[PDB]
TrEMBL record:
It comes from Brassica napus. This is MS5a. Signal peptide: none annotated.
């Protein structure tokens, strides 16, 4: 069967397309992928089938991702479109902690404390959590249903309506507090992910780091 990283990158590609086009294409299957390894796998060219329930059609779809790390989120999605751009990455440091109360009080910074309904209606938040969890240890037999979102904060560069933060493909910094179900209790996680979007190409770069809650 298909490696989890390929399924996740296919879903990232559908995320980029759906957000830019206002569509609801869902992953049906992976047909094939080509990976370039300069020892490390650095590029994936994935051919996938998406389902479009609005027309009951299955659309062959191409996604291209360049990957720069195996141990944390660090990749760029360059192409994501029906089948038939220059390098873009993020070099600036990530915050190492959840935003403090003073970050909210700082009127030059725009932070959005999400409600459960907000992340339930916009599943790219769950996607970024799932990719973060995967990069903690890619050798595990991941069960994404063990993950439960507890709190989400998004930071933008501009003072915009909450709907824009959730629905438009713009630059965001996402903080996700989530529990991993263990019988042996739960494990407490925080993921921090910066999405940067190239203004003309709309290429999407994700840079992320994960931490455990004491």
């Amino acid at each position: 069967d298909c490696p989890l990283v390929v399924k996740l990158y296919a879903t990232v590609g559908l995320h980029r397309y759906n957000m830019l086009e206002g569509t609801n294409l869902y992953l049906h299957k992976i047909e094939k992928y080509v990976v370039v390894c300069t020892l490390m796998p650095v590029s994936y060219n994935i051919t996938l089938i998406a389902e479009d329930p609005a027309t009951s059609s299955f659309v062959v779809f191409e996604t291209n991702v360049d990957q720069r790390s195996l141990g944390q989120i660090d990749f760029t999605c360059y192409i994501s479109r029906p089948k038939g751009p220059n390098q873009f990455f993020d070099a600036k440091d990530l915050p190492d902690k959840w935003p403090s109360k003073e970050a909210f009080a700082d009127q030059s910074r725009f932070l959005y404390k999400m409600q459960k309904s907000d992340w339930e209606e916009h599943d790219w938040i769950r996607l970024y959590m799932e990719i973060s969890f995967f990069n903690r240890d890619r050798c595990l037999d991941h069960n994404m249903s063990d993950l439960k979102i507890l709190d989400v904060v998004v930071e933008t560069e501009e003072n915009v309506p909450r709907e824009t933060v959730l629905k438009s493909l713009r630059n965001v910094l996402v903080y996700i507090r989530y529990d991993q179900d263990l019988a042996d209790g739960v494990c407490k996680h925080i993921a921090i992910v910066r999405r940067t979007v190239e203004p003309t190409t709309h290429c999407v770069c994700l840079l992320g780091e994960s931490q455990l809650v004491p």
